[PDB]
Nucleic acid binder design. Structure first.
Ligand SMILES: [Mg+2]
Ligand SMILES: [Mg+2]
Ligand SMILES: [Mg+2]
Ligand SMILES: [Mg+2]
Ligand SMILES: [Mg+2]
Ligand SMILES: [Mg+2]
Ligand SMILES: [Mg+2]
Ligand SMILES: [Mg+2]
Ligand SMILES: [Mg+2]
Ligand SMILES: [Mg+2]
Ligand SMILES: [Mg+2]
Ligand SMILES: [Mg+2]
Ligand SMILES: [Mg+2]
Ligand SMILES: [Mg+2]
Ligand SMILES: [Mg+2]
Ligand SMILES: [Mg+2]
Ligand SMILES: [Mg+2]
Ligand SMILES: [Mg+2]
Ligand SMILES: [Mg+2]
Ligand SMILES: [Mg+2]
Lengths: 117, 152, 70
RNA sequence: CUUGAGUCUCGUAGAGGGGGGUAGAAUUCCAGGUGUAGCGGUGAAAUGCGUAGAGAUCUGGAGGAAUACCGGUGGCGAAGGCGGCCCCCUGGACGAAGACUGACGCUCAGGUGCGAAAGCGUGGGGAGCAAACAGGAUUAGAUACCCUGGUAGUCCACGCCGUAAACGAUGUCGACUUGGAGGUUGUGCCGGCGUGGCUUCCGGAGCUAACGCGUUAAGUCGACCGCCUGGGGAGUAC
RNA sequence: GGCCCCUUAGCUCAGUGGUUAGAGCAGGCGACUCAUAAUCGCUUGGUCGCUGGUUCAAGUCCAGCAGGGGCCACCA
RNA sequence: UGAGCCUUGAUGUGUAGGAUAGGUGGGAGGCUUUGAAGUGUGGACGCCAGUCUGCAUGGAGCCGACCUUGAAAUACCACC
């Protein structure tokens, strides 16, 4: 469709799900996939296996651009932080950089209250 | 048990073929301690299968047995107080035992005129992926495949 | 946690050093800590408890030296 | 009269107090680009959000509240309490050498002042959180614990209220009485040897019903004040 | 009076004229658990309104007649 | 950035099957160094089995029906 040869993989790994998106160097999205869309509901949705499946589907879907290199930016504390990178490497891409971009307040706002389970 | 002490009991091979595996098969087929009846049934059915397939008694039986042995199974494990179904890998002796039990139980629940004919038909149909034993193996395999996220 | 893959090394070593850098940075500890609100009184009490337990453990470890088991 | 009490000269450490200014991270909201089928939440679900284009990702702007790391049985204050950075006004504490006053002291019924959070009045502000309230679950029932939303309030100025497990459950002031291991902050002599202030842990005599306290006493004594007299009714009625 | 949408298994809905009739819902039989609820696997289940003619091949062609809705008409 | 028509070239693999098949059709002679069997450079489409197309070498053949389909050669061609 339009050759790019460079991309950035954004990983959003929370405690309940994981979302991976591929963008150009300028932030323009090209494709995405989630663990919940791959056929995993509830508890199964929050396992590293679902994360790697979603990563490989995203690599499948973004093939029409001739992407050769990647840099990874991970945010979130979820289980699927590192299996996603392994799946991306096994998809054939070349990995250049890895960075953590998880937000931290420098005080900020007030969090919710403890759950009394 | 609690102490991990138990040993293993030896078995004696069948007279006319000299294979312990047919001995275990006869043992599983035996009811009420009557071994002679079980050996009669096994020999008749196995020779009928041999003359129908045309190769021999032993290798036809082994070929039929190869199409039923499972590879993965489901057990239950705990991680944080909750129990999950998890796939595990079966051992060869367990594979043979499961295959033999499935063949015998599938054969018993048929509608022919004799037990030997039932067993012969079941083995013949299993030697080409058709019997209910093959169906049960497929059911177990796909059930294990569904619960794959929980392994490791 | 800025990692640049250098020249001619496999993927596993880069992954491991990235993991150790992020473990050093104390990121997941912060995400765990800032999840809910904790009253000032609760935090002060927990700090005092931690200090007391540290002191007791150090004294017990030191005291075990003089005695022999058999 | 000078040994208690106080004044003067030189330095040190400090989230001690009142006022003004300013920075960076994050949440929320508004406008735009890419892009396409889910997101969110739970033990599992549902309510809720989305093909009228969400969630994810990049750029620009608006506004409020709080100051990650340093950070520590560290520090300061009569107590309640005090934490980003810079300036202005201001109170206390301690150390070294000397001069000056001449008992000027301690404690205090009534009296006066300060005093967390919630709450009340008038005028502003409102991001996040969240009593009341609504819906979804769970349950024999669930006016709850869990989920999705959400208004007073939490923020500022001025004024009331006067209470807390306001606790070291230990009133203030002075004198005397074996030791050990640390933290923090001054100073003298040549890393060693001394000498002051505050503070954490253990332990001897002694004391205690016991638990325990032990030079920062719950040990040996002196001055003054506050309070107690079996459990309920009651810290209630008039 | 004029447009339009709604019959396909038990229901609701996808179905391209060539060798397709599919999906979602209940009941049933299993699996995990000492045992439930939650999860997971396999299943029971078609007259596509009646008739017509065009192609090698008519579920997909329209033709004759059905039941209710959303807007707009209308001076015996 | 739409709609309408006018302009050409592609376009559509039941089973069978030299075959990625709309009918018809003057129809079986055209094309032929107005560079052909079969190569190499090279692009396109593609149910990805194969067709279209630029160039070069080569240099000049394919050839209808001829046989399985109901059908053939766009071998020249009008019609949509
Ligand atoms: Mg928040
Ligand atoms: Mg939450
Ligand atoms: Mg005084
Ligand atoms: Mg008084
Ligand atoms: Mg207040
Ligand atoms: Mg008010
Ligand atoms: Mg007001
Ligand atoms: Mg109300
Ligand atoms: Mg709530
Ligand atoms: Mg009060
Ligand atoms: Mg009181
Ligand atoms: Mg009191
Ligand atoms: Mg006093
Ligand atoms: Mg006593
Ligand atoms: Mg002590
Ligand atoms: Mg002492
Ligand atoms: Mg005393
Ligand atoms: Mg006493
Ligand atoms: Mg009384
Ligand atoms: Mg009263």
């Amino acid at each position: 469709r339009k050759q790019v040869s460079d991309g950035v993989a954004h990983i959003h790994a929370s405690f309940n799900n994981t979302i991976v998106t591929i963008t150009d160097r300028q932030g323009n999205a090209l494709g995405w996939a989630t663990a919940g869309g791959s056929g995993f509901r509830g508890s199964r949705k929050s396992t590293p296996f679902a994360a790697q499946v979603a990563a490989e589907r995203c690599a499948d879907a973004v093939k029409e651009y001739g992407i050769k290199n990647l840099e990874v930016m991970v945010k979130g504390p979820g289980p699927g932080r590192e299996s996603t990178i392994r799946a991306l490497n096994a998809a054939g891409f070349r990995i250049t950089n890895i960075t953590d971009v998880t937000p931290i307040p420098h005080x900020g706002c007030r969090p919710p209250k403890k759950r009394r389970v | 048990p609690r102490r991990r002490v138990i040993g293993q009991r030896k078995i004696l091979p069948d007279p006319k073929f000299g294979s312990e595996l047919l001995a275990k098969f006869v043992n599983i087929l035996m009811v009420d301690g009557k071994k002679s009846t079980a050996e009669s049934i096994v020999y008749s059915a196995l020779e009928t299968l041999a003359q129908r397939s045309g190769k021999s008694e032993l290798e036809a039986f082994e070929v039929a047995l190869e199409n039923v042995r499972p590879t993965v199974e489901v057990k239950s494990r705990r991680v944080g107080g909750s129990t999950y179904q998890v796939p595990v890998e079966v051992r060869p002796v367990r594979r043979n035992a499961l295959a033999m039990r499935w063949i015998v139980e599938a054969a018993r629940k048929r509608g022919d005129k004799s037990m030997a004919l039932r067993l012969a038909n079941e083995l013949s149909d299993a030697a080409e992926n058709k019997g209910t034993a093959v169906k049960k193996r497929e059911d177990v395999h796909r059930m294990a495949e569904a619960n794959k996220a929980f392994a490791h | 946690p800025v990692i640049k893959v250098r020249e001619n090394e496999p993927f596993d070593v880069a992954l491991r050093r990235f993991k150790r850098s992020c473990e050093k940075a104390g990121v997941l500890a912060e995400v765990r800590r800032r999840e809910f609100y904790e009253k000032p009184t609760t935090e002060r009490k927990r700090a005092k408890a931690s200090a007391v337990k540290r002191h007791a453990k150090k004294l017990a470890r030191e005291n075990a030296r003089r005695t022999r088991l058999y």
